[PDB]
Amino acid sequence: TGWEQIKDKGKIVVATSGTLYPTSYHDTDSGSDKLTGYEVEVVREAAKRLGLKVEFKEMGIDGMLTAVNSGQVDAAANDIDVTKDREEKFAFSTPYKYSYGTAIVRKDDLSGIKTLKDLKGKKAAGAATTVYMEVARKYGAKEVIYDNATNEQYLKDVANGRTDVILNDYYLQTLALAAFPDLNITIHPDIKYMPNKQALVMKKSNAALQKKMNEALKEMSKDGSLTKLSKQFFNKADVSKKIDADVQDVD
């Protein structure tokens, strides 16, 4: 534990899942299977700025925070939201990603949806146990149960009229549109909910490491490195800066 200890070894141990495209995943398209992604690269470069090598320990989100407290790892980078509750238990770096949830509906009629309230009675699809599906339920949407579908399948069913809406992170959905620009789908222009931001998580007592990481992140923020990495993984979008938008809070 400790920044002087990390500095001495010359390596920082960081936990991540590798199952969250495009922020932490493996590059299978190239055949390298290299752990990469927006957040992974941000940490890698930040550590480099600090003369350090990174040792990424892949593990499930569960027990990850426990590994940080136990000292098993020096930090955890896995799209973890900054929340007041977590801030009393851990030390976060400055945020390097800001986002909010949105909805993908049909391009031709927006699936008859104008506001979140119109989700009532609509067929909502996507991951079963996420805060996104919870949002849909709160508004009375019918949850669609899929056996084992793909992203392309989910999107086509919306376009086809088999389903009506998909609730997910804004940036993840912009990639959906970019991937299938000819499909009858689009991100609803007025629905924005649950703003959120992600940062590096470390033991709250590790104030020295926290300050050093922020120092490198700030340097990256000022020279365009963050924006550069963002555009690479989020199809030219820059997720490192907060979007001045009318975002609705949800219970």
UniProtKB/Swiss-Prot annotation:
Q: Which cellular components does GO assign to this protein?
A: plasma membrane
Name the principal localization, coarsely classed. Answer: membrane
How this chain sits in the membrane, per its record, is:
Lipid-anchor
Q: Which PROSITE patterns match?
A: PROKAR_LIPOPROTEIN, SBP_BACTERIAL_3
The yes or no answer to whether the keyword Cell membrane is present is yes
Q: List the InterPro entries.
A: SBP_3_CS (IPR018313), Solute-binding_3/MltF_N (IPR001638)
Q: Which SMART domains match?
A: PBPb (SM00062)
One short Pfam family name for this protein?
Answer: SBP_bac_3
Repressor is among the record's keywords: no
Per UniProt, the keywords (alphabetical) are:
Cell membrane, Lipoprotein, Membrane, Palmitate, Signal, Transport
The set of disulfide-linked cysteines is none
Subcellular location(s) of the protein: Cell membrane
Functionally, this protein is described as follows: Probably part of a binding-protein-dependent transport system.
Write out the similarity annotation.
Answer: Belongs to the bacterial solute-binding protein 3 family.
Q: This chain belongs to which protein, by name?
A: Probable ABC transporter extracellular-binding protein YckB
Q: Which gene encodes it?
A: yckB
